[PDB]
Swiss-Prot record, chain A:
Domain of life the protein comes from: Eukaryota
Organism taxonomic ancestry: Eukaryota, Rhodophyta, Bangiophyceae, Cyanidiales, Cyanidiaceae
Function recorded in the entry: PsaA and PsaB bind P700, the primary electron donor of photosystem I (PSI), as well as the electron acceptors A0, A1 and FX. PSI is a plastocyanin/cytochrome c6-ferredoxin oxidoreductase, converting photonic excitation into a charge separation, which transfers an electron from the donor P700 chlorophyll pair to the spectroscopically characterized acceptors A0, A1, FX, FA and FB in turn. Oxidized P700 is reduced on the lumenal side of the thylakoid membrane by plastocyanin or cytochrome c6.
Residue spans crossing the bilayer: 2-20, 60-73
Protein's UniProt name: Photosystem I P700 chlorophyll a apoprotein A2
Full-protein interval shown: 514 to 586 of 732
Similarity remark: Belongs to the PsaA/PsaB family.
Quaternary state and interactors: The PsaA/B heterodimer binds the P700 chlorophyll special pair and subsequent electron acceptors. PSI consists of a core antenna complex that captures photons, and an electron transfer chain that converts photonic excitation into a charge separation. The eukaryotic PSI reaction center is composed of at least 11 subunits.
Location within or outside the cell: Plastid, Chloroplast thylakoid membrane
Gene giving rise to this polypeptide: psaB
Chain residues that bind [4Fe-4S] cluster: 44, 53
UniProtKB/Swiss-Prot annotation, chain B:
UniProt KW keywords: Chloroplast, Membrane, Photosynthesis, Photosystem I, Plastid, Thylakoid, Transmembrane, Transmembrane helix
Compartments it resides in: Plastid, Chloroplast thylakoid membrane
Membrane association type: Single-pass membrane protein
InterPro entries in UniProt: PSI_PsaJ, PSI_PsaJ_sf
Protein's name in the database: Photosystem I reaction center subunit IX
Residue ranges of the TM segments: 6-26
GO biological process terms held by the UniProt record: photosynthesis
Matches recorded under HAMAP family: PSI_PsaJ
GO annotations of cellular component type: chloroplast thylakoid membrane; photosystem I
Family, per entry: Belongs to the PsaJ family.
Role, per record: May help in the organization of the PsaE and PsaF subunits.
Taxonomy, superkingdom: Eukaryota
Pfam families: PSI_PsaJ (PF01701)
UniProtKB/Swiss-Prot annotation, chain D:
Amino acids binding [4Fe-4S] cluster 2: 20, 47, 50, 53
Positions of [4Fe-4S] cluster 1 binding: 10, 13, 16, 57
Organism: Cyanidioschyzon merolae (strain NIES-3377 / 10D) (Unicellular red alga)
UniProt cofactor note: Binds 2 [4Fe-4S] clusters. Cluster 2 is most probably the spectroscopically characterized electron acceptor FA and cluster 1 is most probably FB.
Enzyme class: oxidoreductase
Gene transcribed to yield this protein: psaC
Cofactor: [4Fe-4S] cluster
Keyword Electron transport (UniProt): yes
Keywords: 4Fe-4S, Chloroplast, Electron transport, Iron, Iron-sulfur, Membrane, Metal-binding, Oxidoreductase, Photosynthesis, Photosystem I, Plastid, Repeat, Thylakoid, Transport
EC number per UniProt: 1.97.1.12
Keyword presence, Thylakoid: yes
Biological process annotations from GO: photosynthetic electron transport in photosystem I
CC per GO annotation: chloroplast thylakoid membrane; photosystem I
Intracellular or extracellular location(s): Plastid, Chloroplast thylakoid membrane
Name of protein: Photosystem I iron-sulfur center
Curated annotation (Swiss-Prot), chain G:
Residues that coordinate or bind [4Fe-4S] cluster: 564, 573
Topology of this chain in the membrane: Multi-pass membrane protein
Localization in the cell: Plastid, Chloroplast thylakoid membrane
EC number, as in UniProt: 1.97.1.12
Lineage, top ranks: Eukaryota, Rhodophyta, Bangiophyceae, Cyanidiales, Cyanidiaceae
Record: residues binding chlorophyll a: 674, 682
Subunit structure: The PsaA/B heterodimer binds the P700 chlorophyll special pair and subsequent electron acceptors. PSI consists of a core antenna complex that captures photons, and an electron transfer chain that converts photonic excitation into a charge separation. The eukaryotic PSI reaction center is composed of at least 11 subunits.
Any one of the GO CC terms: photosystem I
Name under which the protein is recorded: Photosystem I P700 chlorophyll a apoprotein A1
Family: Belongs to the PsaA/PsaB family.
Length: 73, 38, 83, 80, 154, 119, 741, 61
């Protein structure tokens, strides 16, 4: 009970870390603050400014699906 | 002369500190093994 | 590019006759490399469904004769490279 | 088409046009900067949208911002 | 129910089972083998291992559980290494914060972090010993914190 | 293919028979006097323009865009001078008044066929 | 001509530039304004063709670096000889090898982990060897601890000569490029001098050490009555008793009466029925054949004396019509570009290591090697895995040639780029072969999977069902049965007992059994041809589309480790010639994971195990391959569910460290997926949202904390996917076969 | 205002937003973004050297 329930609270706070991340940095981040302009699930911003694989607010869904299946797992 | 600058870098002092505290843990777990109290 | 499609049978002269008279006895064929084959195909040529994996001189002298025969006809088309 | 817009941060250092391998970008003499230059994107019908311009855009934050719009034959970059 | 562990049955079942099970390898050697002396030392390190867990609480599992309430009868279980630990990484954290607010005002702060200035480093390593009433008195000056740093659009 | 897609035929001249690299691949013969070169897409062609121009002088070069109706186009240059160089003929399109920091919020653009920056 | 011009006092040897990290790259000597400088410091630590284009300075750097590598290898082998000396039970192992399990490493007694010291016999415990060092020492004739100590100290001596040699050949005597492009001499000394005198001198060691010693140990002499290899050369009399051709001296050699040397050297093949290894008469005779054959081979390269070839006049002479120019240019490619040489040598080195694995399982060349099955397994598996990775190194460094060091002026209409003219027709037919083999290598498994699951086992691909008996492999294996009487005239037994006669048993342990190949072994060979063709697809797509694709027609202008181009062309992620190597490492993991999952389960069903009274048979799974390899539930159940059971129940025992390196390797495997799936457009402002929490408490790090780059943020997903993925099968395999064999 | 002055920014898409920085060059020829300001730390383009207008020119004393 103790160890698993810490693992479940781990799963919840990670999954809400992803979701509240890509739901409050959904509008604007300091990598690119133009994220309100490209809509929700735009692919990227290209390799500029270090590289920009999965900056969109669709990464909150995208990564938090893996953490959702992990946690409900 | 400039060897002591190399012995002041990040990975070397990282090994000379994690090696040292690693030896604190191992030498503190040979002398007092199975330490769940205190 | 193949400007000379002249002769193929010069390999059949060129590979059988160099492999008939050297017997080199204590191998599978006590006769030569080809004499152990032409005798071991006429037993099977008249629509014989046999010739299993234990049929030695049909399969083995199939491949070892085709692998030198292919090589000598290919080298026969290399015999139209010096032109 | 992939709409390229070039804002008023464009101080005309021309790494954008030299960085675009499609010549959608050209430089226009614009008397509002020190170099007197400001980039333009007239031929966005050939614009791939590869954002190779935005890598080499040394402004504060991206004078030239590429918005991914239409997808024609040329703008998708298919060979056949 | 957490029985006191020195009298729990399955605990002493694990005592007999592990002393006997590890003892089964001890009859594989002669009376003066180095391995035989090593398993003498290991049997000693099992009886000491089970006598030194006497005041714990092993339940029906025969395995010593812990309690993290701060009951002050379980203080040597959790809260004494809790305060001990918080002292140790309060040490480490105040060392690292103090060294970064050193190298923030130097000549080149980039080269300061590759090559640690072991003079000033081992100054701050040892000087950050009393971080509650030094970090607290640097908090009362309004200096541990900051204000109006970087942020995104809103 | 060539009966339905815009073939890109790159026409240019040189002085000596050098050897460049195709965007299809491998080394090309590079006729010394004057040579045209059919291609498939524009990035191949201006990538070849970077392939030759950054090495040496290949000026008086531009692809005639063979659109499948039959005729040509001319883009690089149009006024005869190199694009990052500045000529006084080009009219700038594609600007706004300020940075992204004054672009409109997309809830002010929602249910309208506008952009997130036109204002 | 051939002359050696050497610069002296090239580089001063102070510790000054150690204080300047990234001294070497002017692109990277700016210092870290970001944390990406930290990882680019290590990603440019060995980009020697990115420091300076001057091939002289590069070539000095690499040639001095090889001595550092050989220094680490001599420290490694001196380590193995010392852990053989002080820590191993090798002296006691030499008495009864079939009872005593080999152990060197004796785990220090800290909390719990002293239980890893497995009581393997010999009176002294420690964790069990699977590397098979004791079999190479019994083959090499090392009797007692003294040769292990002394050979260890000579290993440190050669390690000192390689450190001092590399320092000596970068700093105070380093050569010119004209020394390096003198390549006919380099082949001339590596074919002859390295490999020729290596195999010849090793034939000296086997004839004057191993043949008397492993005749005495074959006779069962205890390791105290055995004389030293010392004492066999003071007099021929101790060897004329063992081999009575030593009495004649070298006189029948110089008169070419080599019939007299049938005692020392022969051509028997097979295996020793007593030791379970190869006949060292055959092995010493073999190294003589490599000796004379390679010393013949070395002398075909004209260097100073106008006798021999040059590579130029060879490659020009093959001016074939369908290639046009012939091989013109390859002597200028391979003597000016190092990365192309690394592509060829890593391809042939890796495929040699695979060849090593396949030749070691079926012709076990060391005495008592096929007796202890973990050393038989893991020396197949290990050499199979490095034998894999080096082929991806070929697929990478071929592309690193094609991106950096390609020049179309030297490389115009030859055999090379005429491929690249029709690389669509290369990669398209690899695409077809990959789909055709995927259907016909794995669709058969979904077929047998369904037909066994649908009850209709009459429609499977078993021996009872629709059979797929491999015709060609059984036929040529039947030829290998008929070798030693017919074609190998002077042989006695076959090339192996994986081919011909009845099994060889040593100590009631099956050393080698003739492997039967029916209708399941077939389909796994088509797995292997399939997943070999997919790696060939990704590693030829990585080379033919390396420099200028039709998607992106300027990749050499972008580089080798560039991540992408952009979202244009609808997204061009992962498109570089490095990214194909990123993919070929996962397919390396696939292809070799099912190679060893063919090996370690066909030879736990068809070869290994014990023998009982009246010569009766007993395998480990008990013939449970052809009725079970045909499906996947038979594969996963009957292999991965059943063979795991000795890794999983391994707690409380000495096999529990594999029970830790099993779960932790599942952790590292699963931990790679975080790097593979996400990207730095997430992690960069996740991290910067943490940088707010450092800027609030003034703990802002002065080196700015970026996330990883893209190519690092996928290279690390490879290097965890492979470390965790490989260490799972490592712990699974050694915990499987140590628990029984 | 002048060169060398330590200037906080008030533009939300500046990477150095609410961070002080040093002034390198000011042009008085009606350039819309004349005040070139570089910084200690570094944005994602690797480049500390940017420029600003006059409304985003807030100094410290
Ligand atoms: C750097 C970490 C470190 C530290 C702090 C210590 C500290 C100590 N060691 Mg030690 N030791 C270390 C690393 C370290 N060791 C390593 C790496 C080895 C392996 C070579 C040893 C081998 C070693 C031996 C063999 C002995 C010590 C002993 C001691 C104690 C003597 C005072 C002291 C607590 C002595 C002791 O008190 O142990 C009984 C002793 O006999 N150490
Ligand atoms: C992060 C979670 C976590 C926590 C809270 C613990 C906590 C503990 N572990 Mg541990 N462990 C962990 C993760 C963790 N472990 C992991 C991940 C592994 C696998 C590598 C292990 C492997 C492990 C082993 C093998 C052992 C422990 C042991 C212990 C106990 C004593 C540790 C020790 O050496 O004290 C002694 C050290 C000191 C007293 C040094 C402190 C002195 C300070 C520095 C001096 C200055 C103070 C002023 C303690 C309850 C030991 C035990 O007996 O278990 C009960 C033990 O033998 N752990
Ligand atoms: C200078 C030392 C230092 C200090 C005082 C802090 C302090 C803090 N970090 Mg942290 N951090 C550090 C280094 C440091 N960090 C390093 C080096 C890394 C990279 C691994 C991180 C990564 C990190 C993350 C990812 C997160 C924090 C967070 C936090 C906050 C919550 C506490 C926590 O869980 O820490 C976390 C502690 C760790 C992740 C491990 C400790 C890091 C190293 C191992 C110890 C640091 C000692 C330092 C290297 C000594 C160098 C100086 C010395 C040589 C002179 C707290 C303000 C969290 C936050 O925002 O909460 C509000 C958060 O999510 N940190
Ligand atoms: C017959 C002479 C000879 C021999 C034995 C070797 C042997 C070797 N060369 Mg080599 N080489 C030679 C001539 C020779 N070379 C010549 C003439 C050239 C110039 C054309 C080169 C150019 C060359 C390059 C460019 C490279 C090598 C490398 C290697 C090593 C491959 C690794 C290996 O197999 O480890 C097995 C290790 C051994 C068998 C130990 C060998 C040590 C013995 C004592 C022989 C060494 C004698 C030494 C060369 C004499 C120098 C004379 C000097 C002392 C006055 C191997 C040591 C590679 C390497 O790793 O660099 C070192 C490498 O990159 N060689
Ligand atoms: C008469 C000398 C001689 C002897 C006694 C051996 C003995 C052995 N070799 Mg062998 N070998 C030899 C010459 C010899 N070799 C030559 C000349 C080559 C190079 C072509 C090889 C290449 C070779 C490889 C690649 C391997 C062995 C292996 C073995 C061992 C397996 C046992 C067995 O039945 O093999 C009997 C050996 C043979 C049937 C090989 C015959 C090779 C003939 C002599 C080649 C003649 C060269 C000539 C140019 C003709 C080439 C074309 C020809 C086929 C028509 C055994 C110790 C295997 C091993 O390592 O064991 C684990 C192994 O993998 N050998
Ligand atoms: C288990 C997961 C999985 C599967 C099935 C595949 C399958 C495939 N990959 Mg692959 N891949 C995977 C994971 C997987 N990959 C992963 C994890 C990576 C990460 C690195 C890659 C990376 C990768 C690369 C880089 C490449 C491939 C390629 C291919 C194709 C090889 C050609 C072939 O085998 O065709 C045969 C197809 C199969 C064996 C799939 C099963 C088909 C069954 C047998 C028949 C059809 C089923 C059914 C009847 C359909 C009809 C019913 C339905 C319509 C309702 C093949 C489709 C290559 C490619 O593009 O093709 C050449 C290629 O270049 N893969
Ligand atoms: C790709 C591998 C593969 C193969 C070879 C087979 C083969 C077979 N399956 Mg099958 N199956 C597969 C995958 C495969 N399956 C998968 C992946 C599934 C699950 C989705 C199933 C599910 C399944 C079921 C449920 C059943 C079968 C059954 C069968 C059998 C009869 C099907 C039939 O009539 O064939 C149709 C064949 C053709 C239409 C022929 C087309 C292919 C020809 C040969 C190509 C020739 C081209 C030629 C070479 C061109 C060159 C020459 C030219 C240039 C002149 C047959 C043995 C049935 C059975 O009872 O088994 C006995 C059955 O009930 N299968
Ligand atoms: C194509 C397959 C093949 C292979 C791999 C070999 C391989 C071999 N043969 Mg061989 N042989 C073959 C076909 C083959 N033979 C055929 C078709 C014939 C009949 C002409 C012979 C007749 C033959 C003789 C007469 C002898 C060999 C011998 C040998 C061995 C020494 C190497 C050599 O030939 O020189 C080697 C293992 C020699 C041998 O047994 O020495 C070990 C030997 O004396 N072979
Ligand atoms: C191998 C038989 C190949 C016959 C090609 C005969 C051959 O290579 O002749 C050589 C020929 C080159 O002709 P030239 O006379 O120019 O060759 C001389 C020059 O190459 C030397 O400069 O190459 C081809 O025509 C390439 C055709 C590749 C077409 C695809 C062939 C690969 C498919 C087979 C893959 C099988 C591998 C498994 C083998 C069992
Ligand atoms: C987690 C993750 C990160 C974040 C990884 C962070 C940046 C690295 C964390 C480990 C480093 C090494 C921590 C640095 C700590 C130093 C070692 C100092 C600590 C003190 C001692 C240990 C020496 C990425 O940058 C990334 C990029 C692209 C795709 C996926 C990912 C990704 O999944
Ligand atoms: S970031 Fe991801 S998407 Fe944007 S370019 Fe690099 S790879 Fe393609
Ligand atoms: S915007 Fe950036 S890149 Fe485009 S011109 Fe002005 S400065 Fe050069
Ligand atoms: S969008 Fe792609 S093509 Fe158009 S400019 Fe920016 S980078 Fe060059």
């Amino acid at each position: 009970d103790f160890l698993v329930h810490h693992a479940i609270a781990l799963g919840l706070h990670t999954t809400t870390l992803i979701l509240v991340k890509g739901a409050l940095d959904a509008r604007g981040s300091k990598l690119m603050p133009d994220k309100k302009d490209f809509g929700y699930s735009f692919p990227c911003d290209g390799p500029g400014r270090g590289g920009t694989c999965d900056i969109s607010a669709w990464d909150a869904f995208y990564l938090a699906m893996f953490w959702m299946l992990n946690t409900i797992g | 002369m400039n060897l002591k600058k190399y012995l002041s870098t990040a990975p070397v002092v990282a090994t000379l500190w994690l090696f040292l505290t690693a030896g604190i843990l191992i030498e503190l777990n040979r002398f007092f093994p199975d330490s769940l109290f205190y | 590019y193949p400007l000379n499609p002249a002769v193929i049978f010069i390999a059949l002269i060129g590979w059988s006759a160099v492999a008939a008279i050297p017997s080199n006895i204590p191998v599978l064929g006590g006769t030569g490399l080809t004499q152990a084959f032409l005798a071991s195909i006429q037993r099977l040529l008249a629509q014989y469904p046999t010739g299993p994996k234990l049929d030695d001189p049909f399969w083995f002298y199939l491949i070892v004769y085709h692998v030198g025969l292919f090589a000598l006809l290919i080298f026969g088309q290399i015999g139209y490279a010096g032109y | 088409a992939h709409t390229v817009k070039i804002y008023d941060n464009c101080i005309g250092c021309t790494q954008c046009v030299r960085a675009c391998p499609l010549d959608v970008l050209e430089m226009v003499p614009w008397d509002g900067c020190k170099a007197g230059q400001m980039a333009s994107a007239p031929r966005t019908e050939d614009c791939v949208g590869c954002k190779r311009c935005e890598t080499a855009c040394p402004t504060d934050f991206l004078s030239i911002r590429v918005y991914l719009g239409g997808e024609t034959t040329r703008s998708m970059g298919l060979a056949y | 129910v957490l029985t006191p562990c020195q009298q729990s049955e399955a605990f002493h079942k694990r005592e007999i089972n592990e002393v006997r099970t590890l003892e089964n390898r001890q009859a594989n050697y002669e009376a003066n083998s180095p391995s035989y002396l090593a398993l003498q030392s290991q049997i000693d390190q099992v009886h000491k291992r089970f006598d030194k867990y006497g005041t714990l609480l092993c339940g029906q599992d025969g395995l010593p559980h812990l309690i993290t309430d701060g009951d002050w009868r379980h203080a040597r279980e959790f809260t004494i290494p809790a305060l001990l630990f918080l002292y140790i990484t309060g040490w480490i954290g105040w060392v690292g914060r103090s060294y970064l607010k050193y190298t923030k005002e130097t000549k080149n702060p980039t080269e300061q972090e590759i090559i640690l200035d072991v003079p000033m480093a081992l100054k701050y390593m040892l000087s950050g010993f009393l971080w509650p009433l030094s970090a607290w008195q640097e908090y009362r000056s309004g200096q541990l914190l900051a204000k109006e740093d970087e942020i995104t659009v809103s | 293919c060539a009966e339905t897609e815009e073939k890109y035929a790159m026409t240019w001249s040189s002085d000596q028979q050098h050897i460049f690299e195709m965007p299809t691949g491998g080394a090309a013969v590079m006729n010394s006097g004057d040579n045209l070169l059919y291609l498939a897409r524009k990035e191949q062609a201006l990538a070849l323009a970077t392939q030759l121009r950054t090495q040496f002088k290949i000026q008086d070069y531009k692809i005639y865009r063979i659109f499948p109706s039959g005729e040509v186009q001319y883009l690089h240059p149009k006024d005869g001078v190199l694009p990052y160089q500045v000529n006084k003929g080009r009219e700038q399109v594609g600007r706004v008044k300020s940075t992204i920091g004054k672009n409109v919020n997309p809830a002010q653009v929602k249910f309208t066929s506008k952009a997130t920056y036109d204002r | 001509q051939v002359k050696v011009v050497v610069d002296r006092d090239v580089v001063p040897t102070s510790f000054e530039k150690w204080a300047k990290p990234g001294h070497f790259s002017r692109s990277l000597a700016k210092g870290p304004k970001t944390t990406t400088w930290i990882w680019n410091l290590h990603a440019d630590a060995h980009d020697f063709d990115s420091h300076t284009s001057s091939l002289e300075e590069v070539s000095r750097k690499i040639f001095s670096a090889h001595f550092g590598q050989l220094a680490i290898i001599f420290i490694w082998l001196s380590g193995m000889y010392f852990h053989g000396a002080r820590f191993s039970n090798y002296v006691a192992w030499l008495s009864n090898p079939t009872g005593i399990k080999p152990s060197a490493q004796v785990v220090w007694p800290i909390v719990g982990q002293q239980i890893l010291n497995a009581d393997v016999g010999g009176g002294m415990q420690g964790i069990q060897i699977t590397s098979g060092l004791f079999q190479l020492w019994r083959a090499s004739g090392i009797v007692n601890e003294l040769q292990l100590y002394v050979t260890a100290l000579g290993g440190l001596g050669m390690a000192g000569l390689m450190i001092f040699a590399g320092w000596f050949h970068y700093h105070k005597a380093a050569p010119k490029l004209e020394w390096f492009q003198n390549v006919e001499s380099m082949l001339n000394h590596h074919l002859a001098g390295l490999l020729g005198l290596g195999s010849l001198s090793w034939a000296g060691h086997q004839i004057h050490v191993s043949l008397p010693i492993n005749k005495l140990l074959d006779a069962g002499v205890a390791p105290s009555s055995i004389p030293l290899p010392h004492e066999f050369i003071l007099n021929r009399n101790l060897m004329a008793e063992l081999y009575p051709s030593f009495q004649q001296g070298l006189v029948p050699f110089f008169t070419l009466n080599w019939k007299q040397y049938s005692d020392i050297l022969t051509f028997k093949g097979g295996l020793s029925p007593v030791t379970g290894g190869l006949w060292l008469t055959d092995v010493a005779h073999h190294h003589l054949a490599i000796a004379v054959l390679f010393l013949v081979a070395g002398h075909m390269y004209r260097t100073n004396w106008g006798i021999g070839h040059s590579i130029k006049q060879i490659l020009e002479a093959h001016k074939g019509p369908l290639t046009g120019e012939g091989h013109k240019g390859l002597y200028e490619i391979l003597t000016t570009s190092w990365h192309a040489n690394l592509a060829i040598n890593l391809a042939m080195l890796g495929s040699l290591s695979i060849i090593v694995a396949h030749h070691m399982y079926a012709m076990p060349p060391y005495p008592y090697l096929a007796t202890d099955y973990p050393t038989q397994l893991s020396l197949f598996t290990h050499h199979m895995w490095i034998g894999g990775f080096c082929i991806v190194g070929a697929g990478a460094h071929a592309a690193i040639y094609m991106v950096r060091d390609y020049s179309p002026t030297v490389n115009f209409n030859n055999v090379l780029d005429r491929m690249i003219r029709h690389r669509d027709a290369i990669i398209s037919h690899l695409n077809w072969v990959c789909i055709f083999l995927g259907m016909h290598s794995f669709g058969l498994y979904i077929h047998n999977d369904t037909m066994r699951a649908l009850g209709r086992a009459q429609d499977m691909f078993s021996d009872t069902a629709i059979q797929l008996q491999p015709v060609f492999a059984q036929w040529i294996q039947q030829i290998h049965t008929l070798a030693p009487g017919n074609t190998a005239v002077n042989a006695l037994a076959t090339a192996s007992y994986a081919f011909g006669a009845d099994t060889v048993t040593v100590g009631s342990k099956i050393a080698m059994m003739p492997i039967k190949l029916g209708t399941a072994d077939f389909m796994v060979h088509h797995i292997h041809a399939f997943t070999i063709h997919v790696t060939t697809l990704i590693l030829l797509k990585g080379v033919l589309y390396a420099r200028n694709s039709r998607l992106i027609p300027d990749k050499a202008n972008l580089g080798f480790r560039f991540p992408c181009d952009g979202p244009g062309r609808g997204g061009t992620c992962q498109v570089s010639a490095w990214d194909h190597v990123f993919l070929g490492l996962f397919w390396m993991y696939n292809a070799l994971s099912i190679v060893i999952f063919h090996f370690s389960w066909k030879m736990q069903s068809d070869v290994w195990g014990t023998v009982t009274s009246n010569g009766a048979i007993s395998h480990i799974t008990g013939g449970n391959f052809a009725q079970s390899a045909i499906t996947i539930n038979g594969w996963l159940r009957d292999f991965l569910w059943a063979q795991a059971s000795q890794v999983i129940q391994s707690y409380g025992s000495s096999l529990s460290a594999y029970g830790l390196m099993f779960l932790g390797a599942h952790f590292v495997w699963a931990f790679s997926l975080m790097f593979l799936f996400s990207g730095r457009g997430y992690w960069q402002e996740l991290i910067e949202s943490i940088v707010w929490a450092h800027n609030k408490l003034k703990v802002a790090p002065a080196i700015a904390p970026r996330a990883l780059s893209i190519t690092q943020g996928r290279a690390v997903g490879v290097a965890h996917y492979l470390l965790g993925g490989i260490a799972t099968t490592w712990a699974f395999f050694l915990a499987r076969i140590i628990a029984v064999g | 205002i002048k060169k060398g002055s330590l200037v906080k920014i008030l533009r939300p898409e500046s990477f150095w937003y609410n961070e002080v920085g040093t002034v390198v060059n000011v042009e008085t020829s009606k350039v819309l973004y004349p005040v070139l300001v570089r910084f200690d730390k570094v944005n994602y383009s690797g480049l500390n050297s940017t420029n600003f207008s006059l409304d985003e020119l807030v100094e410290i004393k």
